[PDB]
Write a protein that binds this ligand. Structure first.
Ligand code: MAN
Ligand code: MAN
Ligand code: CA
Ligand code: CA
Length: 410
């Protein structure tokens, strides 16, 4: 094993080197390249990765700085986040229409929310501010045209009606909107965010994407079947995102119903995704060559989000932190690949390095996930998410409401 994680100082060093290796994948700060994206999209034969994964990377580094105190990449990350906001400061740049799902937009909004929560340095005064960007994403996701009567509500996966998948009302789109609402409620103390989050969670429960008995979290269903054709694939990021949002709702509301939802979601996650203490992507990891580029990132979100759950729902700490520790140990045990002696693969539970080429990418998602898992070992030393009591960001009451906003020509 190359990386050592047995003390705070070892974890900091390992995380620093992991942050370096992940950054090698990113070219967006170089002359002639596009800030905020990893190489791609694969539809243009430019690389393995889609736009939203750039947003995921940005958030990973906002967390990295928050967890380690290392600001080395902050300028690169600010540039990347600001470059992708779009003309209406809502993370709907039109050049990316083909990739514009509520999930894709949601992940960028969640990185902006995280920047506000983590007191990440503010953009210049003339540029969109982190809280305002999260508010804009949330507001566009709350817009009435995104909430029709099919399946008695819920967001569709895609934003443009002509995008393939507009007929799929899926967990992730709704989970992103739920999580943003819960987090905006806690930060701003505005209850309209919370009422929407309650409504969307109740919809996810009613439609049965949350299993009423087991609290498994399925993937989605299609409008032409009234959402009854449930795709029962259980992706780790869906349950973990609902856990994260539920923890924010528990912290904000202090309502026992939210504590029960936290506990039930957490029981399900530990049962389903942790195998001998190691996170495992059950829909695809069972054999090599099945996980998509997107799926290779999920276990990093699981670690980062579950670690925050322990701060805002502290009664969960002893259920979560020991399991994140064993999962992160497995992550680093297999970061031993050539040519560097420290290259990271995906198959942590297996105990062995597998070349990311088996899954047809250069390995950025695997690198991101290990960075996330190792950094998040420092959660016990980190400040909890800030609210507007101590945060430094600024909001915008008209976030998402510009007259040139896409909702105005839907
Ligand atoms: O990107 C792959 C993913 O897309 C969406 C759903 O159809 C899933 O079942 C599938 O696994
Ligand atoms: O990567 C998994 C992811 O793939 C696609 O985005 C859709 O099928 C989603 O519902 C699913 O969660
Ligand atoms: Ca997409
Ligand atoms: Ca490829």
């Amino acid at each position: 094993q190359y990386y050592k994680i047995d003390t705070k100082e070892e974890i900091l060093e390992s995380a620093r080197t992991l942050a370096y290796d992940m950054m090698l994948f990113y070219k967006g700060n170089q002359s002639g390249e596009i800030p905020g994206i990893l190489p791609g999209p694969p539809t243009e034969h430019k690389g393995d990765y889609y736009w939203w994964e750039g947003g995921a990377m940005m958030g990973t580094y906002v967390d990295y700085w928050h967890l380690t105190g290392d600001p080395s990449y902050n300028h690169v990350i600010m540039e990347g986040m600001l470059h992708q906001v779009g003309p209406n400061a809502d993370y709907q740049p039109p050049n990316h229409t083909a990739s514009l799902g509520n999930d894709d937009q949601g992940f960028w909004g969640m990185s902006a929310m995280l920047a506000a929560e983590n007191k990440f340095p503010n953009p210049p005064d003339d540029k969109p501010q982190w809280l305002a960007l999260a508010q804009a994403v949330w507001t566009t996701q709350a817009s009435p045209e995104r909430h029709d009567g099919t399946c008695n509500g819920g967001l569709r996966w895609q934003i443009p009606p002509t995008n393939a998948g507009y007929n799929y009302k899926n967990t992730i789109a709704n989970a992103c909107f739920f999580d943003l609402g819960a987090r905006l409620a806690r930060y701003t103390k505005n209850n309209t965010y919370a009422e929407w989050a309650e409504k969307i969670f109740d919809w996810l429960y009613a439609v049965g994407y949350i299993d009423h008995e087991t609290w498994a979290v399925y993937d989605g269903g299609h409008v032409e079947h009234n959402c009854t054709d449930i795709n029962r694939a259980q992706f780790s990021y869906n349950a973990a995102l609902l856990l994260h949002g539920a923890a924010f709702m528990w912290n904000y509301t202090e309502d026992q119903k939210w504590k029960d939802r936290v506990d039930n979601l957490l029981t399900g996650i530990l049962r389903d995704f942790f195998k001998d203490g190691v996170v495992f992507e059950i829909p695809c990891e069972g054999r090599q060559g099945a996980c998509t580029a997107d799926m290779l990132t999920f276990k990093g979100y699981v670690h980062r989000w579950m670690a925050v759950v322990t701060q805002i729902a502290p009664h969960t700490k002893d259920r979560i932190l020991p399991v994140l520790r064993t999962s992160a140990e497995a992550a680093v045990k297999q970061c031993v690949g050539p040519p560097t002696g420290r290259r990271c693969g995906f198959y942590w539970k297996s105990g062995k390095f597998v070349d990311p080429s088996v899954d047809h990418t250069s390995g950025a998602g695997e690198a991101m996930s290990v960075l996330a898992a190792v950094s998040s070992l420092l959660i016990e030393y980190a400040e909890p998410p800030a609210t507007n009591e101590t945060g430094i960001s600024r909001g915008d009451p008209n976030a998402g409401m510009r007259s040139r906003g896409a909702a105005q020509h839907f």
